[PDB]
């Protein structure tokens, strides 16, 4: 029972009718392209249509580092290293240019946002472009890969050791001296996990979303 | 900076007695139709609330006298019974806080 995050809407004040029209159009787009199931950390191959060519097809294989957005525009970022150059591309799912999306290796890592790979060593983000899929048992939980990573030394792009990121996929004991984990832990905010009123309870919403999705068949 | 001239009593009166600075007459006072005391609509009768807080304080004093010391929040409901009131059939297994004055008419 996995409901892709797009259909779960941000907490706000928008009118439910907007989300109903949004979902209607989305589901009407899911029946011309199979939008597979992929978690952040998976490996995808996206096949799209070149707008600047005369009708050519473009393939790009990478790791889904971030999955954000909602509604008919939500996207995912694919990171890869080609010829030693680290590229990313932000792909919109429901765009009418993406021909297909192969889940080439369905995985799931400790953190829900693999942005720090921009700092990890180049080989923790390199993948072979021409690499074949890997099967998986249907009634099997999505594997939880455990790969802690080793960082480029000094200037991290976004200062990952802070508590507010809560990243659990980096080897801090190596690159950061014991002292630096005491100044970078005075920002802990022990009250933020126990704030009962910041919790977006989305059970009664995902239930109705499932009613809608299944009825749209 | 500093003033360049004293301000006269006339200008000061046109400022101090302007309507925006006056105290507005309140259009939402009335009389507790049963109890007969003054009150605002959206607020509790002050006299009634005081007579309730007095009894709450007396009950709580009895509760403290029975629980002994701190850190003794009971694990069962509580019921308060006034003189000549045997514990009803529904209140067995609930702590009783005896009081020694006739039950108030307003206590239902």
């Amino acid at each position: 029972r996995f409901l892709s995050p797009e259909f779960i809407p941000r907490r706000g004040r928008t009118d439910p009718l907007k989300f109903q029209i949004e979902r209607k159009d989305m589901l009407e787009r899911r029946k011309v392209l199979h939008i597979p199931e992929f978690y952040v950390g998976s490996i995808l191959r996206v096949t799209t249509a070149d707008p600047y060519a005369s009708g050519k097809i473009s393939q790009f294989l990478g790791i889904c580092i971030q999955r954000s957005g909602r509604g008919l525009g939500a996207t995912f970022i694919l990171r890869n290293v080609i010829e030693g150059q680290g590229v990313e591309i932000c792909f919109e799912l429901y765009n009418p240019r993406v021909q297909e999306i192969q889940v080439v290796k369905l995985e799931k890592r400790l953190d829900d946002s693999l942005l720090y790979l921009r700092d990890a060593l180049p080989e923790y983000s390199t993948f072979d472009v021409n690499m074949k899929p890997v099967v998986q048992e249907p009634n099997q939980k999505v594997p939880v890969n455990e790969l802690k990573v080793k960082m480029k030394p000094k200037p991290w792009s976004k200062r990952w050791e802070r508590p507010n990121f809560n990243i659990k996929g980096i080897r801090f004991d190596l690159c950061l001296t014991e002292q630096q984990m005491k100044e970078a832990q005075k920002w802990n905010q022990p009250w933020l996990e126990f704030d009962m009123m910041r919790e977006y309870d989305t059970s009664k919403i995902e239930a109705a979303i499932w009613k809608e999705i299944e009825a749209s068949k | 900076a500093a003033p360049k001239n004293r301000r006269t009593i006339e200008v000061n009166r046109c400022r101090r007695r302007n309507p925006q600075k006056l105290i507005k007459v309140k259009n939402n006072i009335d009389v507790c139709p049963e109890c007969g005391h003054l009150k605002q609509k959206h607020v509790l009768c002050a006299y009634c609330y005081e007579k309730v807080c007095k009894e709450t304080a007396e009950i709580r004093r009895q509760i403290g006298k029975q629980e002994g010391g701190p850190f003794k929040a009971p694990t069962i409901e509580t019921v308060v019974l006034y003189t000549g009131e045997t514990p009803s059939e529904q209140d067995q297994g609930k702590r009783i806080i005896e009081r020694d004055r006739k039950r108030p008419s307003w206590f239902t």
């Binding site: 905010q189 | 509790l44 009950i59």
Partner: protein
């Protein structure tokens, strides 16, 4: 600009806000009725409601136990939460607390509010009733009840 910010600002920062609301909530769970400044009670009402929601899940759950450990400071009250309050509201699915406004505070003339957990043993707050059903306007509306019911 403060469009769509639902959390008041009080105390010396976010943390002191959580701690103030925590003390208010602990007092509420201990005595079941407290008089506090109106805005603080209005901020604490949501937390008291969700505390009862967490307490319904019961002792055995660990997430609820950790939450009630944080949000109750004298731990004698955690039994109560899981054995007197949460059982009491096995029927109600919402609205466990009633909140009223009361005469302003004598010293600093602040806007006060009494907040209590529905169903306690204490003498009942003087709630404001509506107009008796036998008043003139209500009688005319009752006549309209009858005459509309027969037509439909």
């Amino acid at each position: 600009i403060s469009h769509g910010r639902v959390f008041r600002r009080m105390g010396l920062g976010p943390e002191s806000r959580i701690h103030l609301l925590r003390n208010l909530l602990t007092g509420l769970v201990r005595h079941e009725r407290i008089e506090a400044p109106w805005a603080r009670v209005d901020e604490m009402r949501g937390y008291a409601e969700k505390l009862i929601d967490y307490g319904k899940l019961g002792d055995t759950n660990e997430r609820a136990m950790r939450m009630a450990d944080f949000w109750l400071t004298e731990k004698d009250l955690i039994p109560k939460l899981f054995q007197v309050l949460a059982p009491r509201y096995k029927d109600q699915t919402g609205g466990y607390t009633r909140m009223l406004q009361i005469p302003n505070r004598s010293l600093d003339r602040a806007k006060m509010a009494v907040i209590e957990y529905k169903g306690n043993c204490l003498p009942p707050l003087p709630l404001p009733r509506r107009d008796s059903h036998l008043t003139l306007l209500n009688q005319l509306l009752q006549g309209l009840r009858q005459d509309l019911r027969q037509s439909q």
